């Protein structure tokens, strides 16, 4: 997921800009986004949310809007228990388990149900599970005593002012997420939000792993308030961003460092190339219009090619294999963009799979490692050019096997297909540097692949008066069998042809195709 917010001083017209840009599965039901607009005499909200939620996660209106990305807030601890004598060892004593015999019903092949026993065991930590390997693990989840999640989120997106928004946020009822904000008064904010236990010791990696479950030393009981957590408001750089990176370059210049926060809140790992691009695209551009903001969102640079090809091409042209040399020249002639017409991109992906692992996150192949001192220009170079060329020899084979040739057009193999609409793809893997993301599937038997994950709801908003906003939803607004509103937007996505989002009554009245009158009596 990506999120940008831009202060008035950084724009042509003097109104803040906001980007909503969740990246999630195109199939997983609970991750499905739905667009809607609610209006009463006392509030207005427009935006997208995950189905079954009664509040809009990605909301905006005439005054404000917000967006989210995943921060991995470590809100839970898995403790490894030490089993002894039917209890568990804890502070040097055998402590017995709390246990109830619960039960549930299971539907059988023939339509009936049988009752199945379910023992629920609990330690002081929380409920207990047995892993397949026989390890006893207790899960302790924070903020189980926070019933107000939905109301907080509702009060956030209907806030009459930034202060009202901060007060709502401060209730600590939303247990995770980075949250970016902007409004027509000109305020922008980034918050690394969630419910984080107060711990006396240990770094994030320690608290992500199995914590020893034999001691009260590791049993936390309190959580951090908002003002302990990384936040940025109206920074000098005039913008904020998050692309799932650690919260250490949320703007440029930064306003804090990792040492200002307990080490368990957030990792200090290399920032992905997509995140490096997020920072560059905002920091390097000034006097932004909504239109140029939208154009920047479409960025699809193979940043990894920029970091590796300077070293890889020469080393590869040395090799005796004429197939290796030809692959090196095809790659050298490429503009390093993930366009539909690219004959080199697929081959590049295949090389990068081996040079950086299947996730494209591996750092070991680089000459110069990542550095927070040069956070958008590292890591860089090829450490072992000879090995990287052997990796290229393999990638040549893999690319021919997968796609039929080393020079198949990117958008001929990469398609977006819903129902009977079939359109050429562009952009791709975030970890290769593409800001706009389509996480292409493995290819089928004919070398055709489609998105499993990426752009879904995309909206960009200027807090002018009235506001101006544009959006698209990759998989349409409905998934009910037979609907016309599943595949009816993906063509527009392939051309980046964004819909104008209609907030004002008169616009809605001009666009209306169906009236459902209802009435509610409780």
């Amino acid at each position: 997921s990506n999120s940008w917010a831009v202060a008035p001083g950084k724009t042509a017209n003097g109104n803040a800009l906001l980007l909503q840009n969740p990246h999630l599965s195109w199939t997983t039901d609970y991750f499905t986004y739905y667009e809607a607009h609610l209006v009463t005499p006392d509030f207005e909200i427009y935006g997208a949310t995950q189905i079954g939620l009664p509040v809009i996660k990605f909301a905006f209106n005439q005054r404000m809007g917000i967006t989210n990305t995943v921060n991995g807030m470590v809100g839970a601890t898995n403790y490894r228990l030490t089993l002894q004598d039917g209890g568990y060892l804890y502070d040097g004593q055998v402590r017995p388990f709390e246990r109830p015999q619960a039960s549930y019903r299971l539907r059988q092949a023939d339509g009936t149900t049988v009752d199945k026993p379910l023992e629920i065991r609990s330690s002081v930590h929380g409920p207990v599970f047995e892993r397949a390997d026989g390890t006893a693990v207790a899960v302790r989840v924070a903020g189980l005593d926070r019933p107000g999640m939905l109301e907080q989120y509702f009060d956030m997106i209907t806030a009459d002012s930034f202060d009202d928004y901060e007060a709502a946020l401060a209730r600590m009822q939303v247990p995770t997420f980075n949250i970016v904000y902007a409004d027509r008064e000109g305020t922008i904010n980034y918050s690394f939000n969630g419910v984080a236990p107060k711990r006396a010791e240990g770094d994030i990696a320690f608290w992500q792993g199995l914590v020893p479950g034999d001691s009260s030393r590791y049993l936390w009981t309190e959580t951090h308030p908002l003002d302990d957590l990384p936040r940025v408001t109206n920074p000098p750089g005039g913008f904020v961003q998050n692309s799932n990176d650690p919260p250490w370059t949320p703007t440029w210049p930064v306003t804090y460092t990792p040492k200002d926060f307990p080490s368990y809140l957030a990792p200090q790992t290399p920032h992905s190339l997509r995140a490096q691009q997020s920072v560059r695209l905002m920091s390097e551009n000034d006097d932004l219009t909504l239109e140029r903001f939208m154009a920047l969102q479409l960025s699809h640079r193979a940043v990894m090619a920029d970091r590796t090809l300077p070293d890889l091409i020469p080393a590869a042209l040395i090799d005796p294999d004429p197939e290796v040399q030809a692959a090196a020249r095809l790659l050298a002639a490429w503009d390093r963009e993930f366009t539909s017409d690219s004959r080199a991109a697929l081959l590049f992906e295949e090389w990068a799979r081996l040079f950086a692992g299947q996730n494209f996150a591996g750092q070991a192949g680089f000459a110069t490692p990542w550095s927070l001192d040069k956070p958008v220009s590292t890591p860089y170079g090829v450490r072992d050019p000879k090995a990287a060329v052997d990796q290229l020899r393999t990638a040549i084979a893999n690319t021919k096997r997968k796609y039929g040739a080393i020079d198949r057009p990117f958008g001929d193999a990469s398609r977006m297909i819903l129902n009977d609409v079939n359109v050429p793809g562009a952009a791709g893997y975030g970890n290769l540097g593409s800001f706009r993301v389509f996480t292409w599937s493995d290819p089928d038997e004919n070398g055709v692949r489609t998105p499993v994950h990426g752009e879904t709801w995309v909206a960009m908003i200027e807090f002018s008066t009235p506001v101006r906003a544009y959006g698209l939803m990759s998989y349409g607004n409905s998934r009910q069998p037979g609907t016309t509103h599943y595949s009816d937007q993906i063509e527009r996505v392939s051309r980046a042809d964004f819909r104008e989002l209609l907030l004002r009554r008169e616009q809605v009245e001009a666009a209306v195709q169906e009236r459902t009158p209802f009435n509610f009596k409780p």
Binding site: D29, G52, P127, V139, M149, P175, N477
Partner: protein, 159 residues
């Protein structure tokens, strides 16, 4: 400079555009929430009912062994019972919005039963507490604490 004059709805209605986007106008908040539940049931009713059933702890009961691991996960972490508590613990005003949302789903289903798939009909009616429950499973027991991280397992979704 003030924002534009807010619109004041005089009747309850959904105006749908050509892309299937509902613009829900309510004369008050429970009305708009009811409209939103109605629209969501129209656009996504089957999968919302499936998920609501799962968050009740009833996925195994309703749909069998493919749903059984999620059921064990949620009952063991007390999700369905805790959701009832979060529900009772709501402020009156917001609770009324949640009841309305759920009433909107129920109403859509009741008025368009051809549109609800057989295997999810047993889920109806849904309540304010089902809405709270699904949000709790989603926030705390899919996002914050995934069953995979606790059970020592493969990747998140399933495919």
């Amino acid at each position: 400079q003030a924002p534009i004059a807010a619109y004041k709805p005089r009747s309850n209605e959904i105006l749908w555009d050509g892309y299937g986007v509902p613009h829900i106008y309510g004369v008050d908040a429970p009305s708009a929430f009811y409209g939103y539940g109605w629209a969501q049931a129209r656009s996504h009713g089957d999968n919302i009912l499936r998920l609501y059933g799962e968050a009740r702890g009833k996925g195994a009961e309703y749909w069998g062994p493919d749903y059984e691991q999620t059921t064990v996960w949620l009952l063991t972490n007390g999700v369905p019972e805790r959701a009832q508590q979060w529900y009772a613990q709501q402020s009156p005003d917001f609770r009324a919005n949640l009841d309305a949302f759920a009433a909107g789903i129920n109403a859509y289903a009741q008025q368009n039963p051809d549109d609800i798939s057989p295997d999810v009909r047993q889920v109806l009616p849904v309540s304010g507490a089902d809405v709270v429950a699904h949000a709790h499973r989603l926030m705390n027991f899919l996002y914050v604490a995934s069953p995979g991280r606790t059970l020592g397992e493969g990747d998140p979704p399933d495919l």
